[PDB]
Symmetry: D2
Subunit: 494 residues, 4 copies
Amino acid sequence: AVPAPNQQPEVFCNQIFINNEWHDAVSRKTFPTVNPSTGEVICQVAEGDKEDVDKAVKAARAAFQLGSPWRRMDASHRGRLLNRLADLIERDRTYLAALETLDNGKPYVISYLVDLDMVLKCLRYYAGWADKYHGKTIPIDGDFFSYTRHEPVGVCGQIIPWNFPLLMQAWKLGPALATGNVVVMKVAEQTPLTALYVANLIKEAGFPPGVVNIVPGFGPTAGAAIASHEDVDKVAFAGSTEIGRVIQVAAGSSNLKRVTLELGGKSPNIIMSDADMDWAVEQAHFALFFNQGQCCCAGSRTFVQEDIYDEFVERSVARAKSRVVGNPFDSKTEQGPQVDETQFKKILGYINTGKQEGAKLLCGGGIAADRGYFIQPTVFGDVQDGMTIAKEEIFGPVMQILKFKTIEEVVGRANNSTYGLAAAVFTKDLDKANYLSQALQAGTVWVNCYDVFGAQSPFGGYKMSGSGRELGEYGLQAYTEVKTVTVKVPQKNS
Amino acid sequence: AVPAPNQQPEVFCNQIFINNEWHDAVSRKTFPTVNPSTGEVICQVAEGDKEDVDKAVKAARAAFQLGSPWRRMDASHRGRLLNRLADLIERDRTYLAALETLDNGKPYVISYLVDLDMVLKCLRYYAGWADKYHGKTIPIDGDFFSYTRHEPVGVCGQIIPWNFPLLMQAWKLGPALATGNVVVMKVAEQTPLTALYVANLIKEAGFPPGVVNIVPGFGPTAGAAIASHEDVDKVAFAGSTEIGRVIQVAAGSSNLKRVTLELGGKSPNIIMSDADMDWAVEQAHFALFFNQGQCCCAGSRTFVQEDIYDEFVERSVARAKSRVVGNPFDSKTEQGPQVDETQFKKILGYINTGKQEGAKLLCGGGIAADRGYFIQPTVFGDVQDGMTIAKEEIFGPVMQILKFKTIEEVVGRANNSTYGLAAAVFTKDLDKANYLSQALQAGTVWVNCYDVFGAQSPFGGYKMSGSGRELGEYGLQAYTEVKTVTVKVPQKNS
Amino acid sequence: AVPAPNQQPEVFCNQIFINNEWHDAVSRKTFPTVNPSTGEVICQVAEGDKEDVDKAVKAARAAFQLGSPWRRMDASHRGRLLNRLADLIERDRTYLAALETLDNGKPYVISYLVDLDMVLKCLRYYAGWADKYHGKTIPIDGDFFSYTRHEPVGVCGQIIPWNFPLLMQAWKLGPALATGNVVVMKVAEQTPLTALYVANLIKEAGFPPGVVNIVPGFGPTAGAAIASHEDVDKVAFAGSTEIGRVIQVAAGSSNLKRVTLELGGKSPNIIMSDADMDWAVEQAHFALFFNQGQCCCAGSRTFVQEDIYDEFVERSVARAKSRVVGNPFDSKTEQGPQVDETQFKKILGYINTGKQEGAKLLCGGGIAADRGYFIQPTVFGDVQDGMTIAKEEIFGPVMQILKFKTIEEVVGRANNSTYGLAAAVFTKDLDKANYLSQALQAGTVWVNCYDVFGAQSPFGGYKMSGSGRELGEYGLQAYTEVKTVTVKVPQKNS
Amino acid sequence: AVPAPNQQPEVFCNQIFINNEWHDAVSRKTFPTVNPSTGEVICQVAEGDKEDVDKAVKAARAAFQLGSPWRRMDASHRGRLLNRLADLIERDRTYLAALETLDNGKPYVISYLVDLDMVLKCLRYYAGWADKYHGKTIPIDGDFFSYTRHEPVGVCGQIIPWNFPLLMQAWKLGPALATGNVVVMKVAEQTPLTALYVANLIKEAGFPPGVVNIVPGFGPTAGAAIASHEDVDKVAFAGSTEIGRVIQVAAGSSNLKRVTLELGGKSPNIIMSDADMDWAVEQAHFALFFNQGQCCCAGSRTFVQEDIYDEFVERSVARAKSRVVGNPFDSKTEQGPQVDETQFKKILGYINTGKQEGAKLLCGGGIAADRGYFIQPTVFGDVQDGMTIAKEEIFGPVMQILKFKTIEEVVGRANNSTYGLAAAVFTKDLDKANYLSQALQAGTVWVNCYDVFGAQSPFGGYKMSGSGRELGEYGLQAYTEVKTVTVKVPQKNS
Ligand code: NA
Ligand code: NA
Ligand code: NA
Ligand code: NA
């Protein structure tokens, strides 16, 4: 059951959060954040720049000093703090869900039942890791005792995108805080508000000042300042493959900080002839259209075996046409607006290219409302591998359906991409499932499902979809610095 | 390629092995070992008893003392020694395979290509573990540094059966020596010879004296003396469920040693109607008949879905009839003799039992040869769950085929056993495979295969089929004693 | 900050707990539990026997059936339920701490700040393990996919002692429930009450019926019934070594259930001449006297280097004489009564034996109050290795001080014991600490501290002190049954 | 025992190694490699450039194709190939040790007993990892089976320095090959020869063509081509912090390949007043002077507590003055020449700067021979933190001794560096040892020892000394790509 929303939630936090206190930008500049359902300004937000990043980094470094409350704190207590944060988020779940919808556009029902649920599960999962990520005692040759300490990497710059504002904040804060790091986080200008409210809850939960610092602002300013900072030890970035490059170059051009990246994809969703048709159609719809199509791993190349192609397309068109686009606070709404005007225009551009290059437009193809950034659920059939809409990540409600004949053929075509974030296989056959999951060059392969995220299982890209993994035990690796201590002993024995 | 065998290999080792030297029993007693293909005595072997076990245990304890060569040796060097032993066994592979066949009865081609190959793979795999089984550094609360050492358990008594003499020796020595334990091993009276030859290779490889001690002799004497010994730290026993019960009592009545057990089975092999018929028929044949049916995990309840039952049975009977029983040194032979007269009689008893209780005798059922202990490949059809041949381990070439209708039914029937060693499922369907593999209460579930052992994957029983696991990383757990060291420090920091 | 206690708390739960309901014993018999501070009856408790244990086992087996709520529950949700239970115990902390003191005798301030704190930390620790104890995927030879599932062992019998009633319950429930097992728990007849109240909170927390069942009663009856039960898969026992044998023999005589034991100790605390004197005197006092001396790992052989012996003894005697024995609800009380009349008389007997065998009585030596089971803190000097008080676990406020000269001497003397639960070393020297912690044959070695338990670090005995480990990741191993699934694939690639 | 060297070993391999064949450069250009002891040319070596790197990458890519011999090979068999490679290197040990000395300058006795020993131990260690680096089965929420595959990263570019030519080749090939990767290796122009002979041994050992390809040539050409290559998945670079930046920029500017870096150090070696003097002096000498001072982790800031400074310095100067500099083939020689003229001049320039900036020149300071690149062991006293010789990595036989008062003071001064590769502490005190090992910001902290490497224990930098770890289980992480497979199942149970 979904509690009724406040469709116009008050904003309480709209500044820079450093040392558990709220700050205007050094410059006093602010930027508007807009409600994409209406195109209207929600509020002004402090416009952080390099000087604000510098204040944040110094606060973080101070909190990380040997002997500080955060460094001395029992690991188990970091877990308690994470669990307390989750409880406060749960207390404020309807507010956060409404604010998320207001600022991002996703349906409130989904904000409440999905994003907020996943946030809680992520924070709670990582809370349990805080005191369990052991180093090693090692049977080295000779008269020595050798062991490893798993220490925190240090001051962690985290730049997060607008598509799942709260969930991405949690995917970043969970592992970083579980491992004893400190954070300078840059949130998306499209969706700064929910992360800043969470900062208030971080303070309420009792995290020492400077442990989490949040700097709203723009990428070429605030994000760049983080990536290039001489006292930031590690940077994590999620966004486009384009800005990804800028990050890795800045790390190399500054202090050789450690880098992980989560970038785009053009993920293949492969429907074999023996798939359960009803399930495959529904899941392929979800795979593409979930979150207004704004998902890093959207199943944006739907490959369908020729024998079932005609029926699959027919069912897929019927399902896209039934999808309800509208006010994301309305319980019936399945699809909200796209996040902002830039994305709106980009998607319309991709739709135009699909028409121009001769993909068969089967439904949708245009704007879905006279106000707000709403786009009709759009399906192109008879898509070919060389088409722009088969190659580039659209990040909107635009489905590509491609026909194939053999399992060998589809592997090659699926893997013929510079991306490799995710893939899926729909089939009843044991051998086909195993053949495909091994052969597909992707970070996650879903079998008879899609977008199944568990805090327990890692996620991240092959190839130019990024590097490193988030979630699960793996998500702790980028947040750990390993120290070997090797001690002379009188006489080593087994 | 299989090198031509020496059909009358010379015997070089037939005494008690302690401190890298050969000894008679204190009593001077010897016992004959028999060639089961001919029923003739091969040679006499020293008959170890309590006093000889006591000498072995003292030697092992001495080798385990702090500061000893074996205790001080680098972990990596334990690996070098295991690798050296493997190389010596490989040097002597053709001889060992022939001796194995001579004393045990299994076909020489199989001793050569299967048993010896697996021995080499097992030792080489565990050589790799010797310096990699790390303890942990642990982020305990308060101002402490806490860590664990993985130490050897100490003096390990190992009692091994006659079905796979060399391979079972390797399964036991591999992990015990990788982890720096010392061993007192009791080999089967039916098949002492190959293990004793391997003792010469242990000395040759360079193992310090007292690290491995081997005492041939009988169960209620030498085996019991190990189990009950007040200075044995750990016992590993493989054999009948009946004797397994004795060992745990003897252990708890002595010094509370740590015990692992590898016992019998009545493992279900489930053939779904969508299975590959030709593959399932061949695999079900192998699953039962492998090694003269003398396999702990033999597929001795072959459940076949009713729609394919008739065809399956026809094919299975033709395959049993075609199976060549004969001189295990003849390359055409698929089945050698049973290991001894006691087993021979027991199997004839079970064949008569099946006849008496109304199972349909479809082929075989009698003695296959004049000399030795040869039994015809025997297939019973229309076997019912309450039949003795459906419940008790026969340990011979006697196949039970049962009919079932539904997947739900067969789970219940398969699991209705006090055994739980292995199980298998033959199906092309992904959901059926996952359903059954989860539902079956067995230590190993094979899917579209049978008897697939890898040194890398653990093996052992649920229920009264055993406890603990052999092989893989898991096989090291029973051979490690864990010590926590917790040290006050001036100020703990993450 | 310790809340004011209810010095005569009411009792709400005093029956058998099965399927989340309270039951009288089938026999309708009850037994009294006594307040050791006064020797008066608190209340009657249901006296469970074999029939009651049978009801509990059947309930647990039902809760463990494939497809049941507890079996289908997400691993993360098992975590949630453990966390909820912890929260409820924290809600009722003041009450439970007072009840613990009422039934056990330990000081309220200690029940509140130590026991309850450790109970919460243990449950919260294992809550975090619920969804993190991964199986493996394994690069087996050949065209196969092989992996392991870590499954629950099943129905777990858990028999817990009276020394830390609430903490020992938590040490048992945490790992068992985190791993999805079900439990039949037998609590000590001396201290049944707090565990029964906790059962009420298990129901309140939302654990499915049958997941935890508690049968209070007597050892030769209910305990034996659990250990011998044909449908109990695993047994964990903590108590005396005598019953340890009983338990392992029963298990070998019944169904081959998996067994773990935590038994006595006579743990050595070694004070080197270079120790911090004041710290070593205070910690040696704590190591022996903690919990009325009723600790499995009490430092009951205090070895002191000859050069500092006289001063250490002088200071230790002064400290023992200053230790306040009294009503455990009085804030000034450091030592409460012994748990019951049996222990009270047994300890007095050992004091008499010490006096008669020529140990030097330096202080204490008799009863400390006319009512309740109070014993004076007692210190024996010039204790020798062969003395009864140097060999047998007293489990009372009776300190043994032994003189030694050299580090090799103390190692050998410390290790010359059939026990090996714990040991400690007080020294400022790096090499001495390392030499000793390696050389000491004990499950836990403390360096410049004593009785430092974290949920994070494993604990358990060498030799006759027990087998298996509790706490840490290691605490999960005894509660896991490992299944290997090995699947034929079209073509294995790396 | 050290076999007599051939002081003029024949060169057999001097070309580009691709597909197990030898190739001239496309350009047909060659470059000379020089003997640093004489300044004379040994032989010409193929000058690989971008076009040759391209050929190597294509060969490696083909070798990595799904279904290839290398991709299909059992993991255990990769292990066998690594062990076979080690056997071959052992067979040719005396030759390789001499050739290493000829091309690099290090003493033959060291090449033989240290470098070759370590190479063998590294390869044999990683051989054991081949079939043991498991992925996970994961208890994700919902009706799913989730697991991870540990797959190879793919085509790995490996750029290795001249200081430990064979050992660095082994450190890179061991983990890459153990995990099933393919390699394009660029070796240092100063020391190409031994790596090329090993390539001949890789062929001999039976590695499939293309699995290891070696391109000799210059940095700005061949090295750059690797770092910038669009079909290289992963680059590992060891060398100066200067070139480390270029690598990371190249990766970000090309295809976002994965990057690990092993870079410079200025490692602090801290001698507390309570240290064993003779030991600390000898170990500090080794720490700095080992390998002609050409070690990433040289103890090039020797901090000595004021109370022992004068004595330590006197003893240090005596040891430096008696260190034998000469022909590296003479068994008496402790120090050979520097690797080349560039280094020779750079080091002399640092010595001049040291004198100019006011450090006290205690011994050495100049050229040690009239031919070859020999420099006198040089000791500077009264070094201050702000001096150039205290800040910049010299990479030669130049020792810096600094005085300090307190342990708190020395932590700050030690950590006040942009480097963090290693550090050491000499003390008899347990608490000072644990204090310092925790506080020091370095990848390896040695205690009462220095330069203790073991294949089992990881090594790598903090801060600008690099990122990622080599050796140990950790060395496998950078060579692994993690894939999650998440499978819908009928009903998930524990
Ligand atoms: Na917005
Ligand atoms: Na025989
Ligand atoms: Na009581
Ligand atoms: Na050279």
